Amino acid sequence: KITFPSDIDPQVFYELPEAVQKELLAEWKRTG
Numbered sequence: 585k586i587t588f589p590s591d592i593d594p595q596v597f598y599e600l601p602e603a604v605q606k607e608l609l610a611e612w613k614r615t616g
Contacts (some may be wrong), residue, residue: 587612 588594
């Protein structure tokens with residue numbers, strides 16, 4: 585189950601490099 589912040593778009597997010605995806609997902613996991 586993936587949860588994108590209320591200010592992050594899924595099409596503009598997946599367009600980001602993986603290293604950026606993991607760091608952003610790891611931050612989403614810390615907050616939830």
